[PDB]
Enzyme design. Structure first.
Site, PDB file in Angstrom:
ATOM      1  N   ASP E  44     -27.461 -12.699   2.122  1.00 23.30           N
ATOM      2  CA  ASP E  44     -27.464 -13.283   0.785  1.00 23.30           C
ATOM      3  C   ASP E  44     -26.229 -12.826   0.019  1.00 23.30           C
ATOM      4  O   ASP E  44     -25.938 -11.626  -0.041  1.00 23.30           O
ATOM      5  CB  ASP E  44     -28.738 -12.894   0.042  1.00 23.30           C
ATOM      6  N   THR E  77     -24.962 -18.981  -5.656  1.00 21.94           N
ATOM      7  CA  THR E  77     -24.226 -17.811  -6.124  1.00 21.94           C
ATOM      8  C   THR E  77     -22.883 -17.686  -5.417  1.00 21.94           C
ATOM      9  O   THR E  77     -21.851 -17.451  -6.057  1.00 21.94           O
ATOM     10  CB  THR E  77     -25.066 -16.547  -5.915  1.00 21.94           C
ATOM     11  N   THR E  78     -22.871 -17.859  -4.092  1.00 29.18           N
ATOM     12  CA  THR E  78     -21.646 -17.652  -3.326  1.00 29.18           C
ATOM     13  C   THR E  78     -20.673 -18.813  -3.463  1.00 29.18           C
ATOM     14  O   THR E  78     -19.502 -18.683  -3.090  1.00 29.18           O
ATOM     15  CB  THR E  78     -21.976 -17.426  -1.852  1.00 29.18           C
ATOM     16  N   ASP E 337     -37.301 -20.036  -6.499  1.00 28.05           N
ATOM     17  CA  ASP E 337     -36.227 -20.981  -6.218  1.00 28.05           C
ATOM     18  C   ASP E 337     -36.676 -22.415  -6.478  1.00 28.05           C
ATOM     19  O   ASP E 337     -35.854 -23.284  -6.783  1.00 28.05           O
ATOM     20  CB  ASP E 337     -35.749 -20.818  -4.776  1.00 28.05           C
TER      21      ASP E 337
HETATM   22  N1  LIG Z   1     -28.986 -28.323   3.726  1.00 27.12           N
HETATM   23  C1  LIG Z   1     -27.664 -28.105   3.524  1.00 27.12           C
HETATM   24  N2  LIG Z   1     -26.730 -28.769   4.239  1.00 27.12           N
HETATM   25  C2  LIG Z   1     -25.415 -28.560   4.048  1.00 27.12           C
HETATM   26  N3  LIG Z   1     -24.921 -27.691   3.149  1.00 27.12           N
HETATM   27  C3  LIG Z   1     -25.743 -26.958   2.364  1.00 27.12           C
HETATM   28  C4  LIG Z   1     -27.197 -27.129   2.513  1.00 27.12           C
HETATM   29  N4  LIG Z   1     -27.777 -26.295   1.632  1.00 27.12           N
HETATM   30  C5  LIG Z   1     -26.783 -25.646   0.974  1.00 27.12           C
HETATM   31  N5  LIG Z   1     -25.571 -26.038   1.411  1.00 27.12           N
HETATM   32  C6  LIG Z   1     -24.270 -25.533   0.905  1.00 27.12           C
HETATM   33  O1  LIG Z   1     -24.298 -24.105   0.839  1.00 27.12           O
HETATM   34  C7  LIG Z   1     -23.764 -23.644  -0.404  1.00 27.12           C
HETATM   35  C8  LIG Z   1     -24.609 -22.489  -0.927  1.00 27.12           C
HETATM   36  O2  LIG Z   1     -24.474 -21.380  -0.040  1.00 27.12           O
HETATM   37  P1  LIG Z   1     -25.693 -20.365   0.249  1.00 27.12           P
HETATM   38  O3  LIG Z   1     -26.902 -21.167   0.664  1.00 27.12           O
HETATM   39  O4  LIG Z   1     -25.174 -19.292   1.173  1.00 27.12           O
HETATM   40  O5  LIG Z   1     -25.999 -19.668  -1.170  1.00 27.12           O
HETATM   41  P2  LIG Z   1     -27.338 -19.993  -2.003  1.00 27.12           P
HETATM   42  O6  LIG Z   1     -28.526 -19.583  -1.168  1.00 27.12           O
HETATM   43  O7  LIG Z   1     -27.254 -21.396  -2.556  1.00 27.12           O
HETATM   44  O8  LIG Z   1     -27.233 -18.962  -3.233  1.00 27.12           O
HETATM   45  P3  LIG Z   1     -28.170 -19.143  -4.528  1.00 27.12           P
HETATM   46  O9  LIG Z   1     -29.517 -19.509  -3.953  1.00 27.12           O
HETATM   47  O10 LIG Z   1     -28.136 -17.789  -5.196  1.00 27.12           O
HETATM   48  O11 LIG Z   1     -27.496 -20.243  -5.313  1.00 27.12           O
HETATM   49  C9  LIG Z   1     -23.754 -24.828  -1.356  1.00 27.12           C
HETATM   50  O12 LIG Z   1     -22.469 -24.950  -1.974  1.00 27.12           O
HETATM   51  C10 LIG Z   1     -24.033 -26.050  -0.505  1.00 27.12           C
HETATM   52  O13 LIG Z   1     -22.899 -26.922  -0.520  1.00 27.12           O
END
Ligand SMILES: Nc1ncnc2c1ncn2[C@@H]1O[C@H](COP(=O)(O)OP(=O)(O)OP(=O)(O)O)[C@@H](O)[C@H]1O
Ligand SMILES: Nc1ncnc2c1ncn2[C@@H]1O[C@H](COP(=O)(O)OP(=O)(O)OP(=O)(O)O)[C@@H](O)[C@H]1O
Lengths: 124, 62, 38, 49, 469
Positions: E44, E77-78, E337
């Site tokens: 995370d 977040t990232t 979430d």
């Molecule tokens: N099902 C999916 N398919 C393709 N890309 C995705 C999908 N879900 C998320 N993403 C991409 O991943 C990025 C988010 O990264 P990550 O999931 O590592 O962090 P996060 O869990 O969203 O953090 P937070 O929940 O704190 O916002 C987003 O910019 C999005 O473009």
């Protein structure tokens, strides 16, 4: 002068209950028709240097005994651990509901099928 | 069980011994030689300009 | 030799869970791309 | 076929994984193409030796 | 002054170079070792930046930037840290050519306001009153999280929770403080219960009745270590061994050991207030309830179910069971979430595609607007569009494809088409994002653009550093 661990397999054989104390907390009773099992025949077989007691056709035991008659204590002690090592080989196989020929037969057959499966997919 | 290597890469292989005896009871070191040779062949793939994401998704289908 | 004649047999759950656990352990180490110490 | 994909600037692993899959199906004269970034039958495209 | 300007950029570039590999569901995992010698394996991005222990003020501002996205949106977040570091990478090429940072700061605001209207017309508006669109959007983001098999059941639990507190299509701001999620050992996630009142995980020990009808609850803060003035108002439930005997003779339920964070939650359910002393404790500070008992459920355990507030207030509470303790702490974050993703739609009733999809049209259309501008808005806004392509370039890296050829093929797909094209990380290839069911709300992208631009404007406005004692 019967051993305690030998009596736990005897009471499990005829389905009897081990009685720890004969006093039933106010007097003395024998607990009739509770600590008794059923059998068929008990013969004192003449075995050399230890006359044994064999029990036949108990309630639910399924166990037996192997008399390893030999010449000295050197050949009898090494043959007892050989029977115990050969018992666990046949035991651990015939438990799990199906088996597979192992010892290098599994991974050698998988090295040819997974290579021909690799040429069927592609896509990096 | 008695091997103590203070390294996080070696500490990963310590827990699979606890997942092996609690599942079936046998097999333990055959998991170790397979998974370490899995890592050594995949390490050659990293030098051959392959991302490990295709290696992870390819291993689950294999 | 043939394992059917020699009787060398192994259970299936020791062979299935070995290939299942070794690939999941090789996945977790391959997912490590950065080291942080404190 | 690997250095032919390296000198042409193509993806060396994306073509060679699809080239061996074409030979596994029965393709006997499929190779790399210097013009297109995909595999093609070199016997039909008159790439001979 | 150039030695401090480049030091703020290269320190912020090192932060974005570490968090970028954890992007997406197929992101690379990290190995974090603390100072005591232990190891922790997690991926995370908000967890890594908390345990980074940075010392530079430029890197510490990115830590506050990571917490600024979770309070307003709660998602992505990232994604903010990558575009913040790559913008200073493009600003490094502009600072070599002789541009003052106060012109790039005002030009980035014009690139921000133009970036909002581009994302506004390309978005798909949705209806807030339709619970079916709220259900599929909540279970979409939950499939990429830890709890992924219970996403089809936990998503209606979050939809029906916000409809009891917030009126549909009328209110804008939703506070996430008045919502509570409880968890207990044993049971399953398949059984759920939405309590309109309050639930506490404490016991009625050792009050031997545990069932009181027509209950008035008074929160006592003065520690009993007196009982006749409690019976003067007729109180039957108190909320905090010699004191146990006299309270059982007066027939009052005794519940103690309550955290102070839970005290504010009881103040909004029934309308009661914490008292300060016994002489202040009167009937004007208590509430009214029709039910207060401890139900011994099979999986939920011994929970205090209090319903029937009959008072003004917008509270509802969800009771969640589960077998392992490590599951229910992730199941509480699973609904959280889902609670935050509905909060993104009530302020902006719109949806967009994901997986690097809107970053292509944000990079292509801002370049066309940069061709008609003048001054520094033809170079810095064009560099703003070039730094928006780092999100599909990193998502193509974590998917296992070419990081250059995937974004280049996506730029031609968005030039003739629309936002349907993008990178699908599940199948590993370019496909229609709306067909593979990957969606994201509007505030996860429009506030990530605003907070990253405000951080770069705060970084470029720093000229020198000074020590103070
Ligand atoms: N099902 C999916 N398919 C393709 N890309 C995705 C999908 N879900 C998320 N993403 C991409 O991943 C990025 C988010 O990264 P990550 O999931 O590592 O962090 P996060 O869990 O969203 O953090 P937070 O929940 O704190 O916002 C987003 O910019 C999005 O473009
Ligand atoms: N009867 C047999 N004939 C030939 N090879 C055998 C036979 N029994 C076992 N093997 C081989 O010996 C290996 C077992 O090695 P060993 O018993 O030393 O450790 P292990 O049981 O693999 O470790 P662990 O208990 O974690 O699984 C197996 O890989 C198997 O191929």
């Amino acid at each position: 002068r019967v051993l305690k661990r030998d009596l736990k397999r005897i009471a499990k054989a005829s389905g009897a209950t081990i009685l720890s104390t004969l006093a039933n907390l106010e007097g003395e009773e024998t607990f009739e028709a509770a600590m008794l099992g059923q059998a068929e025949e008990v013969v004192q077989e003449r075995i050399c240097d230890d006359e044994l007691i064999l029990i036949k056709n108990t309630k639910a035991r399924t166990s037996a005994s192997i008399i390893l008659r030999g010449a000295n204590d050197f050949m009898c002690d090494e043959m007892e651990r050989s029977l115990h090592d050969a018992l666990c080989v046949v035991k651990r196989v015939l438990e799990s509901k199906s088996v597979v020929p192992g010892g290098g037969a599994v991974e050698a057959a998988l090295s040819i099928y997974l290579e021909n499966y690799a040429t069927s997919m592609g896509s990096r | 069980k008695l091997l103590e290597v203070e390294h996080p890469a070696a500490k990963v292989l310590c827990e699979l011994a606890d997942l092996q005896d609690k599942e079936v009871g046998d097999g333990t070191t055959s998991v170790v030689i397979i998974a370490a040779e899995l890592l050594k062949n995949a390490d050659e793939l990293v030098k051959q300009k392959i991302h490990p994401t295709s290696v992870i998704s390819g291993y689950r289908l294999a | 030799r043939d394992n059917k004649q020699a009787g060398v047999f192994e259970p299936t759950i020791v062979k299935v869970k070995s290939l299942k656990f070794a690939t999941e352990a090789a996945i977790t180490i391959l997912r490590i791309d950065d080291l942080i110490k404190l | 076929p690997r250095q032919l994909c390296d000198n042409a600037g193509f993806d060396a692993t994306n073509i060679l994984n699809k080239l061996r899959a074409r030979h596994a199906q029965g393709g006997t004269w499929y190779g790399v193409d210097i013009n297109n970034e995909d595999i093609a039958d070199n016997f039909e495209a008159f790439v001979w030796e | 002054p150039a030695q401090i300007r480049f030091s703020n950029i290269s320190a912020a570039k090192a932060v974005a170079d570490a968090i970028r590999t954890s992007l997406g569901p197929k992101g690379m995992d990290k190995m974090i070792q603390d100072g005591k010698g232990d190891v922790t394996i997690t991926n995370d991005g908000a967890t890594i930046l908390k345990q980074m222990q940075v010392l530079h003020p430029a890197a510490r501002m990115l830590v506050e930037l990571s917490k600024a996205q979770d309070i307003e949106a709660g998602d992505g977040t990232t994604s903010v840290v990558i575009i913040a570091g790559s913008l200073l990478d493009s600003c490094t090429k502009l600072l070599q050519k002789g541009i003052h940072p106060t012109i790039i700061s005002e030009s980035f605001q014009k690139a921000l306001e133009k970036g909002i209207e581009i994302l506004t017309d390309m978005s798909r508006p949705v209806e807030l009153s339709d619970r079916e669109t709220l259900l599929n959007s909540a279970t979409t983001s939950l499939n990429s999280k830890v709890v992924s098999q219970y996403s089809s059941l936990l998503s209606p639990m979050s939809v029906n929770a916000v409809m009891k507190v917030i009126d549909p299509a009328t209110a804008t701001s939703v506070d996430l403080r008045d919502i509570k999620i409880v968890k207990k050992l044993g049971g399953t996630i398949d059984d759920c219960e939405l309590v309109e009142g309050l639930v506490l995980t404490q016991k009625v020990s050792n009050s031997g009745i545990t069932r009181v009808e027509k209950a008035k609850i008074g929160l006592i803060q003065f520690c009993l270590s007196l009982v006749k003035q409690i019976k003067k108002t007729g109180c039957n439930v108190l909320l905090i061994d010699l004191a146990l005997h006299f309270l059982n003779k007066m027939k009052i339920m005794v519940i103690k050991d309550i955290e102070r964070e839970d005290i504010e939650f009881i103040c909004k359910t029934i309308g009661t207030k914490p008292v300060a002393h016994i002489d202040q404790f009167t009937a004007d500070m208590l509430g009214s309830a029709e039910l207060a008992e401890e139900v011994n459920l099979n999986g939920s355990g011994k929970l205090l179910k209090i319903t029937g507030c009959a008072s003004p207030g917008k509270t509802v509470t969800i009771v969640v069971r589960g077998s392992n303790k490590l599951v229910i702490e992730e199941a509480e974050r699973s609904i959280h979430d889902a609670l935050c993703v509905i909060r993104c739609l009530v302020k902006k009733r719109a949806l967009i595609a994901g997986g690097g999809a809107p970053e292509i049209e944000l990079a292509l259309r801002l370049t066309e607007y940069s061709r008609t501008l003048s001054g520094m808005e033809s170079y810095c806004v064009r560099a703003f569009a070039d730094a928006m392509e780092v999100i599909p370039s990193t998502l193509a890296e974590n998917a296992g494809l070419n990081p250059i050829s995937t974004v280049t093929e996506l730029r031609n797909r968005h030039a003739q088409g629309e936002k349907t094209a993008g990178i699908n990380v599940r199948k590993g290839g370019i496909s229609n994002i709306l067909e593979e069911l990957v969606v994201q709300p509007l505030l996860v992208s429009v506030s990530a653009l605003t907070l990253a631009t405000e951080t770069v404007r705060s970084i470029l406005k720093i000229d020198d550093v000074v020590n103070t004692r």
